[PDB]
Amino acid sequence: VDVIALGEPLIQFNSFNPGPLRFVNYFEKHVAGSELNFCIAVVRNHLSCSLIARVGNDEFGKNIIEYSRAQGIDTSHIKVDNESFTGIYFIQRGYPIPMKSELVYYRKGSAGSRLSPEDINENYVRNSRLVHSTGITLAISDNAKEAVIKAFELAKSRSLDTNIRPKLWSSLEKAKETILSILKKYDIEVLITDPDDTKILLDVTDPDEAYRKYKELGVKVLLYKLGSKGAIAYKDNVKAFKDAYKVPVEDPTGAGDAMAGTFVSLYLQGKDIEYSLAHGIAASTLVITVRGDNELTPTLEDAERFLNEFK
Amino acid sequence: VDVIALGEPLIQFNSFNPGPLRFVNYFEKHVAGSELNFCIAVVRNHLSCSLIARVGNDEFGKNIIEYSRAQGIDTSHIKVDNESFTGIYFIQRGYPIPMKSELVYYRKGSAGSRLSPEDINENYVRNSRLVHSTGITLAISDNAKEAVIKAFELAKSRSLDTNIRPKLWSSLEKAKETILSILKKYDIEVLITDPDDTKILLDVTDPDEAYRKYKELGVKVLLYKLGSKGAIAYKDNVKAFKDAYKVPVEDPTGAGDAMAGTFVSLYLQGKDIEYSLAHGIAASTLVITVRGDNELTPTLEDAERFLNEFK
Amino acid sequence: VDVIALGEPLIQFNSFNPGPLRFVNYFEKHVAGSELNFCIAVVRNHLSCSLIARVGNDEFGKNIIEYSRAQGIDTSHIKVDNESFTGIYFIQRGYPIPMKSELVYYRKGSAGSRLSPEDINENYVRNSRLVHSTGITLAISDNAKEAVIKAFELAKSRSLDTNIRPKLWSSLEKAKETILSILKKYDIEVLITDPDDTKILLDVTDPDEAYRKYKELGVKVLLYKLGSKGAIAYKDNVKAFKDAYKVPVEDPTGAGDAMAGTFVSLYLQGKDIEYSLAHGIAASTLVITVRGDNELTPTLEDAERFLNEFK
Amino acid sequence: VDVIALGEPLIQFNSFNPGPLRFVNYFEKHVAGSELNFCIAVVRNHLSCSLIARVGNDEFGKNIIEYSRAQGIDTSHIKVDNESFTGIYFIQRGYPIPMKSELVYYRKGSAGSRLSPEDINENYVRNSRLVHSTGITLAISDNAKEAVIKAFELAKSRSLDTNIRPKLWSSLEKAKETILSILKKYDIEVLITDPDDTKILLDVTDPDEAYRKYKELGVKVLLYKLGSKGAIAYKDNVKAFKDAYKVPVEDPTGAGDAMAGTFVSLYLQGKDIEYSLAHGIAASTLVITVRGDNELTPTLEDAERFLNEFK
Amino acid sequence: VDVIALGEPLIQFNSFNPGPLRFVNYFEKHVAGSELNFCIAVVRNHLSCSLIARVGNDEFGKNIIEYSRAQGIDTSHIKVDNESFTGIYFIQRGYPIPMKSELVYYRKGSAGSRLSPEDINENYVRNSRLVHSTGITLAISDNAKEAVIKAFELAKSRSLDTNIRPKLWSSLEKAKETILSILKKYDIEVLITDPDDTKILLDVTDPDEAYRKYKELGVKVLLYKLGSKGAIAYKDNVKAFKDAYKVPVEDPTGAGDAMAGTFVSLYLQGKDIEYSLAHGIAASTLVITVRGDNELTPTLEDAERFLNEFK
Amino acid sequence: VDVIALGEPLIQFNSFNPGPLRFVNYFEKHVAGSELNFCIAVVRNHLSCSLIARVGNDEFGKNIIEYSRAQGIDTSHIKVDNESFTGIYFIQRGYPIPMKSELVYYRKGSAGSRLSPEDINENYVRNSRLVHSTGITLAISDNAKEAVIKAFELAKSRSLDTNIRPKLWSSLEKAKETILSILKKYDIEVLITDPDDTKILLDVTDPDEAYRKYKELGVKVLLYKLGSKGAIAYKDNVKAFKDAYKVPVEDPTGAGDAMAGTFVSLYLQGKDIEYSLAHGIAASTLVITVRGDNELTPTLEDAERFLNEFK
Ligand SMILES: Nc1ncnc2c1ncn2[C@@H]1O[C@H](COP(=O)(O)OP(=O)(O)NP(=O)(O)O)[C@@H](O)[C@H]1O
Ligand SMILES: Nc1ncnc2c1ncn2[C@@H]1O[C@H](COP(=O)(O)OP(=O)(O)NP(=O)(O)O)[C@@H](O)[C@H]1O
Ligand SMILES: Nc1ncnc2c1ncn2[C@@H]1O[C@H](COP(=O)(O)OP(=O)(O)NP(=O)(O)O)[C@@H](O)[C@H]1O
Numbered sequence A, B, C, D, E, F: 001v002d003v004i005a006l007g008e009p010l011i012q013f014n015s016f017n018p019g020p021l022r023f024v025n026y027f028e029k030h031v032a033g034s035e036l037n038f039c040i041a042v043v044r045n046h047l048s049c050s051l052i053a054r055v056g057n058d059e060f061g062k063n064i065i066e067y068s069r070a071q072g073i074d075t076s077h078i079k080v081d082n083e084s085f086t087g088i089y090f091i092q093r094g095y096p097i098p099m100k101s102e103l104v105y106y107r108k109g110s111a112g113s114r115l116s117p118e119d120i121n122e123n124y125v126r127n128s129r130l131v132h133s134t135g136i137t138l139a140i141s142d143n144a145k146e147a148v149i150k151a152f153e154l155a156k157s158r159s160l161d162t163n164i165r166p167k168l169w170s171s172l173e174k175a176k177e178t179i180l181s182i183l184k185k186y187d188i189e190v191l192i193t194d195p196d197d198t199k200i201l202l203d204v205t206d207p208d209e210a211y212r213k214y215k216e217l218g219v220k221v222l223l224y225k226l227g228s229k230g231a232i233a234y235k236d237n238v239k240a241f242k243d244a245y246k247v248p249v250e251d252p253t254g255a256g257d258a259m260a261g262t263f264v265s266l267y268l269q270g271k272d273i274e275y276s277l278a279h280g281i282a283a284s285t286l287v288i289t290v291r292g293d294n295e296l297t298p299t300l301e302d303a304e305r306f307l308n309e310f311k
């Protein structure tokens, strides 16, 4: 398998319309979770991809495996854990801030949080080209964090999305220290991050300076996401910038995962950072126009159409 | 207040279409929870009713309070608890058994489960006519169980719906020991139960025999629910039976609570057991026709219309 | 035109779900009104049919005109009245009586109620085979009543559905005197009625007795609707009875209209009362399975299929 | 209570989709009416607020009462009137003008319009800090106008939103005389208006000039709404302007109400006009992003978040 | 692989409500086609199953492969055919016959119709335990019929559902002759059929006589479907009857495929005809309660629950 | 009749949500087809308009006729053809290009494609003011192409929208040869086209140059559509340009037809090209805001409101 990702796949319940949850009557279900979204993007760009994860022995767990399998993700290492349930979350859209979303989690002690070093086979990780994970997975439990540590130790190369969700951590200091410690211990082939997380991690928001400090920690490629201002990629003292496109925002949740999975799978295939980046911007632009995270993540050929035709 | 109920109110996510949850795309939100449903039925039959409960300091908790307030439930004693979240559940409908439902809970460690003896004021409880709770509240935590024991000690009179949900107990033996202990300790003015629960508690299913044993336990009035077969009420040496009505079933969830709160509230105001039973059946028939436990619970006058007009 | 009808066409808002209107969030719009439903049945049985009516100079009036035109009703004599609004109503379904509906009208002083003798042209009316109206049109205003009196004076033959809606009259006594007054004055080729109306009008229940007394009033054919118990047609010494079919009921509103239009138009084509009745029953049966009143009114040939195939 | 409002609360039926009503199949029900929307804004900014009004003895009236109660509006003086019906209206969205709405009323002779001096108690009114109403209530009937005259005579302070709806008046000249008559007679602590109304009332457009002429009429604070161009507040020699924010507009209906209730209640709490205005703009901005008028009216603290975070 | 099926998978567009298609506004998409439904039932009973088929190089073709893969069907032999499109059909529900459905096909010259002997690998068919197909596949083109002939020639054992759809054949004679010719050429381990098809094929409707005549053609097991009267299974001069259950019918489409695939996969596993049959009745009962064909097809363990609990 | 259009009207199945069709679950039905959309716009601007077309003897064909009849299109010459089916298509929205759509046709060999010279009566066509068709009708079959050639020979005046859909042609060379041949043969009073089509026909995109070449081909008035850039109209030595308006785009399908039928119908009645152009833009702006090609096409008076009020 080309890419192994470790994480907790989740069921998302997206409010049918904007406003505080107490006034929403209908909820539309999607399959999501940061690494799962990433994996969808990897397969859409024609690399094989496996999600190492746990789900509950329940309908929602089975929904995750079947969906993933439908979309071409290798599910052989998604373990069913009878001891706990499949984690979920709700999205409150556009309140109190228009065009922004807020997540309400029901994932404490979930099957997914029970991801552990025992799930990480040494031969299997070593046969892959790259291992990916995120700061969500580092947050969910000590054993999931240790699973990432073990996979990263065994990996040929690594990618990490910082993805700091302060609600998942006892403190920002803990987030900071946990993520910095991974960056300091391992070379990171592609780091995906943004000004918010980098302020926490490095006390830096400036893109060029971010690259300089992350490069000093052993990061080869920096993908620096700027939201509605676009994104920047850096490799070997070369910068590429691509501006965002103006579209109506339904739900931005998962836009960075579409970008990151697209960027990383194209980069792995030998595409330059300019092309990988423009495709990542294309992927993000499509996903935010709708409620789900990953259904509109384009294939490489569809993303090329987007870039050649969309103005 | 006339009636006090102790319980965990919950947000219900009702599948828009029947079938396994992994194939359901849309969920319709309702406010529910057994004793909440019970309280709705009480106020529909013109007694004041307070729910003693905890909710989270979240949208779903505000939902519960606002909905209760809208429906005329006294919400003075629904406490917002910042330490945890408002419990929720999903309804899977019509699979694997047509016209029945299954519940998937997200309530472990919830705010509602934090209901405790300190939430039970002696002067407030003594001030009421009757105190109601259920085996669900006895199951959700040790402190919620102790809160009911304390409310029952203080009460002028007591109703209990056995409501055994096997998923909420460590074993059926624990359910039996916990519920039997309450029955041996207290007089119960109205006990609401059914064959399934009575099999567990008494190792009998025969209605006459159930009444004989329950009566030895200090049960004055037995409401013995038979689902699509109707229900029987017993008092002293009177036995009243009424058949269920044939209606299309959307979701029978909450049917028992609609019957129980209707029955108890009418019984308390002097109505005989036949009248109370028939209004109970009428309430249950209406609610099972829709998604939603309690919106269709009829007022006294609407249940009379039903009984006079429907065949 | 073969058939002229006088009445008030209306916009119907059905509850998407059963229950008290205060809990209904969605309403589905349909085009209806008793004589409009009747006209749809007439054209489906391959006669030409004109509705004489008023609508407001508003969207809902244009809705009525266009929907009628789409369905092949001659709309030449539906007049736009800029002085008032198109009448509308809401349907509450299945509460407090399952499988039954209640109507909440917003029609007082509507354009439809402004139907008047001046809308009734002598030459136009004399050139049709039959003029139909209902006790609804007799109720809505003094001028609509007078419009029916005038059309009935000029007509070659008449039908009348008694259609007593107690909400539209100041008393049942007022309805009785107004409707008997029509019956006494004119010959009625087809009278459509039922036990409820007949009890008010003639203080009899028994169908055979009803026909004897109606015959004294100048009634040639009696269509006597019995709801879930079927219907009976009488002509001379022929009595025909047909049982209702068991179907899941969504909304019975307009069933009688589909029956009455179907019956009358077949009867006008020389079909005997047995055939006309069976077709009327087929028409009623189909329309009660769904929210709208007239979309499922069968053509002659479709009603024949239903009768041959459905048991 | 801190604030008393007089008006007609209404049931709103919004088109699920944009377009001429004749092509709309689905309508989504919301609870609204100008002074009701205003009351929701008042309570969200943590003052107590009572609506004095009538509703019909019908489902939609119960809907109004329960929704108001759910939202913490004091409903003690919303009277059930068995002699008429609860008024309602429809919203046509985005046709013929995108991002704008048109209202089609069914409210003539409604229970709400039967609001009258006899509903206005001297002691109750004198015991509040402020009485609010609008030019809508002045229009709906002679007695509702008189009810406002009486409440304004007894009040410690008053607010008035001019809210001229040309459909509710026999002429613009009638509106002008009726509303000037109020302004001439009473001191007005907060006047809410806009160029359209001010042009009718004072034959001026320029905001500075408007305030000079309004000040002669006894107006202390002027809130001057400019739609997509923002709003201006005036008090003494303070002028405050705030631009509108760019958001996708679903339905602007009730924006001014959310603004006016927010502004007035903050102003009554000793917030300066700058702060009150910015909060009113935040409230308007949120509610126009969705179908209903008042579900997204922010609390004080949520409006602070919006202001600090949204650009 | 245990079971190979040959057929044309199809996209189904199910009317959201009953009535003639011209009045239906919404269509709900499902993945279906007789053999695909069969394959879902086979995998739900824990045998491996492969669908040999073609789909278009289009979204609907990809929808078929992904859905099938999600549900555990081996899709390695579903070929994408760029020369044509994925076939679809619409279902008109409950008109002109309540509780019955009518299919409108758009499948002429489809990718699926291009199934040919060239798609049938000799080694692959010979490694399987059983090959299944239906009279639909025999109808769709000469080359699909020849594909079935070749697979049946190579198979260890065979199953056939007669599934005569007269719309797909030039005449009933052609259907009859084509199906009889297969029955005469091959032993058939399980034949699934009913009175309608057997009247065409044998001029027999009587179950016991049907068995006798089909046994004389080389059929080992006869599964004889009786709709709302249940179904009968015959093997070695033993009959098993199981009555149907009373449930509300949403859409019966695919009920026989659920039954047949369940029956055949359990029979293959050594279950007796009594058990295989009761499970087939369970599968059919669940699917007809909803719009899709195969989402509610139960697993073996869920079907056991159904049979033990549903009365 | 003033205007005759020749075409294939179609049933549209519009995805309820954006994205790849395999992820869409719900489809909303509309009546569409380019020349049908054109005719709607003609009658909205107060000319009589007949559509010459074939539909199937099926629900979808009856749909088309009834809808056209409802909207005031003369349907005397929409012929029901028992030999084939009514053509349909699906709209995939927002993927892979945001705010654009893609069409998937089910129309090969349709009834509409059977439009032929025999459907074109010489006296009927000569009797009209103008004849319209499009490159779609020229593509669907040889006989439909010949039907347009014949109608154009007979016509007093002609409009043509080039409407090149590459999927409907064997090659772009065939489109170019077929359309160029019509242009060289006939005077064209209004030609509607755009850069994409003009690139194919003339190997130019520059608007001024396009007009120069088209004018040599006997085009009197050129309508040159620029999508989100607006449109230009040319006549003699006048050039009128109007920008597009910024609105949220749901589906731009049919926008060109709304503009074309509006423009042509207004031009025919004496309006100058600026007025006709501006009303065209107004019509197109409205339709792109919803699913559905033609429901929001404005009347003359509504487009004036739009132009006077919208910014
Ligand atoms: N408002 C917007 N308008 C246009 N494009 C946007 C907008 N917001 C986000 N994007 C796109 O989203 C890309 C990545 O967004 P970003 O906020 O960095 O990821 P994120 O916060 O990681 N999302 P998530 O996956 O929930 O963690 C940007 O580079 C844009 O291409
Ligand atoms: N299939 C049915 N048909 C008609 N009435 C029914 C049916 N099922 C239940 N009821 C009615 O509901 C009443 C309560 O039955 P029951 O199903 O035992 O309660 P329950 O569902 O256990 N309630 P709950 O604990 O509140 O989820 C019965 O006495 C009937 O009046
Ligand atoms: N519950 C039902 N079940 C089956 N068929 C029914 C049912 N109700 C009505 N019908 C059929 O409808 C026919 C007409 O019924 P009826 O109740 O007299 O109409 P109605 O009251 O005049 N309806 P309306 O058109 O709204 O005035 C009956 O004779 C039956 O064929």
Ligand SMILES: Nc1ncnc2c1ncn2[C@@H]1O[C@H](COP(=O)(O)OP(=O)(O)NP(=O)(O)O)[C@@H](O)[C@H]1O
Pocket (backbone or CB within 6 Å): D099, D163, D194, D225, D226, D227, D228, D229, D230, D231, D243, D244, D245, D246, D247, D249, D252, D253, D254, D255, D256, D257, D258, D259, D280, D281, D282, D284, D285, D288
């Ligand atoms: N199109 C818009 N875009 C952004 N903000 C808007 C828009 N329209 C209104 N607003 C906001 O709403 C505020 C109030 O607008 P306004 O149009 O004066 O209300 P209104 O006409 O009184 N509405 P109503 O409550 O139905 O009477 C404005 O000052 C803006 O903050």
Ligand SMILES: Nc1ncnc2c1ncn2[C@@H]1O[C@H](COP(=O)(O)OP(=O)(O)NP(=O)(O)O)[C@@H](O)[C@H]1O
Pocket (backbone or CB within 6 Å): E163, E194, E225, E226, E227, E228, E229, E230, E231, E244, E245, E246, E247, E249, E252, E253, E254, E255, E256, E257, E258, E259, E280, E281, E282, E284, E285, E288
């Ligand atoms: N009205 C009904 N009520 C209850 N069960 C039914 C009803 N109709 C069908 N069934 C069930 O469906 C089973 C098989 O139905 P049947 O009509 O033989 O298959 P079919 O016509 O092949 N369906 P299809 O898959 O579209 O080809 C029966 O044995 C019943 O278990």
Ligand SMILES: O=C(O)C(=O)C[C@H](O)[C@H](O)CO
Pocket (backbone or CB within 6 Å): B010, B032, B033, B034, B035, B037, B103, B136, B165, B253, B254, B255, B256, B257, B293
């Ligand atoms: O299981 C629970 O706790 C519930 O609250 C579910 C339902 O609301 C109720 O119990 C049905 O009786």
Ligand SMILES: O=C(O)C(=O)C[C@H](O)[C@H](O)CO
Pocket (backbone or CB within 6 Å): F010, F032, F033, F034, F035, F037, F103, F136, F165, F253, F254, F255, F256, F257, F293
């Ligand atoms: O492509 C076609 O033939 C259509 O009819 C699609 C649209 O209705 C129309 O062409 C859009 O211009």
